[PDB]
Design an enzyme around this catalytic site. Structure first.
Site, PDB file in Angstrom:
ATOM      1  N   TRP A   5       0.850  -1.196   0.000  1.00 18.62           N
ATOM      2  CA  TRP A   5       0.000   0.000   0.000  1.00 18.62           C
ATOM      3  C   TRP A   5       0.883   1.243   0.000  1.00 18.62           C
ATOM      4  O   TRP A   5       1.745   1.404   0.866  1.00 18.62           O
ATOM      5  CB  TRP A   5      -0.881  -0.021   1.242  1.00 18.62           C
ATOM      6  CG  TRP A   5      -1.967   0.989   1.302  1.00 18.62           C
ATOM      7  CD1 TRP A   5      -2.938   1.212   0.369  1.00 18.62           C
ATOM      8  CD2 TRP A   5      -2.253   1.863   2.397  1.00 18.62           C
ATOM      9  NE1 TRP A   5      -3.794   2.193   0.803  1.00 18.62           N
ATOM     10  CE2 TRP A   5      -3.393   2.613   2.044  1.00 18.62           C
ATOM     11  CE3 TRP A   5      -1.646   2.101   3.632  1.00 18.62           C
ATOM     12  CZ2 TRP A   5      -3.937   3.586   2.882  1.00 18.62           C
ATOM     13  CZ3 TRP A   5      -2.187   3.069   4.462  1.00 18.62           C
ATOM     14  CH2 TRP A   5      -3.318   3.803   4.081  1.00 18.62           C
ATOM     15  N   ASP A  55      -2.057  -5.311   8.981  1.00 17.95           N
ATOM     16  CA  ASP A  55      -2.892  -4.282   8.371  1.00 17.95           C
ATOM     17  C   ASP A  55      -4.094  -5.006   7.755  1.00 17.95           C
ATOM     18  O   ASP A  55      -3.961  -5.668   6.725  1.00 17.95           O
ATOM     19  CB  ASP A  55      -2.064  -3.520   7.313  1.00 17.95           C
ATOM     20  CG  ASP A  55      -2.859  -2.438   6.588  1.00 17.95           C
ATOM     21  OD1 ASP A  55      -4.110  -2.474   6.634  1.00 17.95           O
ATOM     22  OD2 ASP A  55      -2.221  -1.567   5.943  1.00 17.95           O
ATOM     23  N   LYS A  73     -13.893   0.094   4.031  1.00 19.10           N
ATOM     24  CA  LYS A  73     -14.272  -0.704   2.878  1.00 19.10           C
ATOM     25  C   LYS A  73     -15.404  -1.673   3.196  1.00 19.10           C
ATOM     26  O   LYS A  73     -16.391  -1.707   2.484  1.00 19.10           O
ATOM     27  CB  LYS A  73     -13.041  -1.432   2.341  1.00 19.10           C
ATOM     28  CG  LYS A  73     -12.013  -0.461   1.735  1.00 19.10           C
ATOM     29  CD  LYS A  73     -10.697  -0.428   2.508  1.00 19.10           C
ATOM     30  CE  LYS A  73      -9.672   0.556   1.906  1.00 19.10           C
ATOM     31  NZ  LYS A  73      -8.289   0.190   2.359  1.00 19.10           N
TER      32      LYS A  73
END
EC number: 2.6.1.1
Lengths: 399, 399
Positions: free
Chosen positions: A133, A214, A249
């Site tokens: 990311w 994460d 999300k």
């Protein structure tokens, strides 16, 4: 006296922005946006979830104050986060080895974790996957932490090069942090298998580094529970952990900034002690976390009916994504793609590397008005049964 | 391998949390909370404003996505902020010299400013008033910025000792930051007069330091435009400024984390260079700011009917604080207070230093169930017509 701002050198232009300007200014009908960083439905929209709407009506009608909560935010959100992450009945929860601070997104959690680490521990470096990311490096660097890369994606062959991963991590020493994507690796979509996770777990115990998980796409991969398997393998093994979770999300709550940093240690006393220093990290930052999104999540998860509706909504998003992945592979085949794209169906979540070069990406925009990012990352949620054919024909044509 | 968390030294106990905890445990019915840091109404509650409920209903009905906005958040919010702060039709706004980032509270705005400064400027030191809001030091220190104190309040005589202020600021050099509270200084409630602000503004121009205006109580002092006069006096004069504004208090939106960091440079082009770098500071932190609160405020300020409703409740709150200041002073006399407290009615906002020692504060708590902070700071919004008599009888008893 010369200005304090007078000699500041402009930050480099954000390509995430230059491209989006182009797209909006592009007047061609049938332009396709595979460059977007969020989920989109079959109509090209990112709606508010029905479950989320209902909770917001509940908060409108029932909330009586906006007074500050503690630095760790809403307790119920902390409990729900923990049960989602580790599973109800987890010995981590029963043994009171885990403390959770609601944060402004997984991003906030990452930064809180980094500030806390840099300020209270010997941690000097964080290992992240290549690729990872884009925001990971800047977050950790800003807290004074060095960021190193470990081998992950075999880009020519479209695989998780596990042997290279393992070997490259031998350079990571006890006391380093190693960051792993919980599921739906971003941007590759290539996840460890259960056994690879177990192997990684075992190695971390043997090597002594600190895992940081994460996990921003729980429920976008194979399912809510399945998507946490990797984290839970780590939880069973390593007695210390940091988890930066996100609801941006899986609740489509992006801009409300709903996430969490969870510390796990060997015992209550240690985790509580650590956690007080984490509060200090938060206090020196934005202090209290934003209530609205977290209250929404806690309201939904605390209520059976509402929870059912949300899970079906999330399932729908997960299954549409998987459907588009399959359709993409089949339609490339049909349109005569001169090579195999089957890797696409072995990957999880919104993002894959298309494996296209920057030249091919360029041509796809200019000539066919198909927009991907420079790295060749594509968002399969940008796909629909209606744009698939011209999309795939464009790709075939640039190969 | 030994844990990473094992040797973390415990954080010091949080005195604000400690007091809040003691108060919650106190089952005495007439207990009085003059320690909390938030507004309270005549019934002792911190309600959601009518204007805010209405705006939240509107968002509920209108909003169709929660997708990320830019790092600077909601543009309408930024515009409304700039107008509130500088005055509509401000030459600053006209010359396009100001850029606003929506942040998670004024706290977030202070942290962003600090990181921005540490990373992009020659700034090494920030000057704050003695005394000041408790978190200032933590925030600037976390960014590696030294915090120095300047002269402010004469505690014995209950005045802003303006000659002390000026002389101590001689120590502040070009390219230092000097932080001022825009209005309703926390915790003293003692503000510079217009002419003192103008003098201060002239001094910062002469010496060359960078003014940072922390403004969290616009509208709690003399009124919205009046409370912004000091900031505008700086704006009229200094080519560069930073403003960290908050809506936690003037909208009672505490836990939604609504605030902003405003940069002001000599010209558009320069503030643009500065602001992009600020965006990078935000991206390294929590990224996007939380939408719900900023949307509420944008909706209210941008609608004539809702804004009037908002200004009314805020006037009610400002006026209730002033009435309590007056009633407090008057009831103390009538209960036999052995000295004069009339400095209280002169001061602005919820907070004043009472002048009570820690001995007196302590006895007040234990014996009379009257809570104040150890420094003797008191929150007049903790007062009501109903609790004023027992409260003043308590204070007189420990004098």
């Amino acid at each position: 006296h010369v200005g304090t701002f007078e000699n500041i050198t402009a930050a480099p232009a954000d390509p995430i922005l230059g491209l989006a300007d182009l797209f909006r200014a592009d007047e061609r009908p049938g332009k396709v946006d595979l460059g977007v960083g969020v989920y989109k439905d079959e109509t090209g929209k990112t709606p508010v979830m029905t479950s989320v709407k209902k909770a917001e009506q509940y908060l409108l009608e029932n909330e009586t104050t906006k007074t500050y909560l503690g630095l760790d935010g809403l307790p119920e959100f902390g409990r729900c986060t923990q049960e989602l992450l580790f599973g109800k009945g987890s010995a981590l929860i029963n043994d009171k080895r885990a403390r959770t601070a609601q944060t402004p997104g997984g991003s906030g959690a990452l930064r809180v974790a980094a500030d806390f680490l840099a300020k209270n521990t010997s941690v000097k470096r964080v290992w992240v996957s290549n690729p990872t990311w884009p925001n990971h490096k800047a977050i950790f660097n800003s807290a004074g932490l060095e960021v190193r890369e470990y081998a992950y994606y075999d880009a020519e062959n479209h695989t998780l090069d596990f042997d290279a991963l393992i070997n490259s991590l031998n350079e990571a020493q006890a006391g380093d942090v190693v960051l792993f994507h919980g599921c739906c690796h971003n941007p590759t979509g290539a996840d460890p298998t259960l056994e690879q996770w177990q192997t990684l777990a075992q190695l971390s115990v043997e090597k002594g580094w600190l895992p940081l998980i994460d996990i921003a796409y729980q429920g976008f991969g194979r399912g809510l529970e399945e998507d946490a398997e990797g984290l839970r393998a780590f939880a069973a093994m390593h007695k210390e952990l940091i988890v930066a979770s996100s609801c941006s999300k899986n609740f489509s709550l992006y801009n409300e900034r709903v996430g969490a940093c969870t510390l796990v240690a060997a015992d209550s006393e240690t985790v509580d002690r650590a956690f007080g220093q984490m509060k200090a990290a938060i206090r020196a930052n934005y202090s209290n976390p934003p209530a609205h999104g977290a209250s929404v999540v806690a309201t939904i998860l605390s209520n059976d009916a509402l929870r059912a509706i949300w899970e079906q909504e999330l399932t729908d998003m997960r299954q549409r994504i998987q459907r588009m992945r399959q359709l993409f592979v089949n339609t490339l085949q049909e349109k005569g793609a001169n090579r195999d794209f089957s890797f696409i169906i072995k990957q999880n979540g919104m993002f894959s590397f298309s494996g296209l070069t920057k030249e091919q990406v360029l041509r796809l925009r200019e000539e066919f008005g198909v927009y991907a990012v420079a790295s060749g990352r594509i968002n399969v949620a940008g796909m629909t049964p209606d744009n698939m054919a011209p999309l795939c024909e464009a790709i075939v044509a640039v190969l």
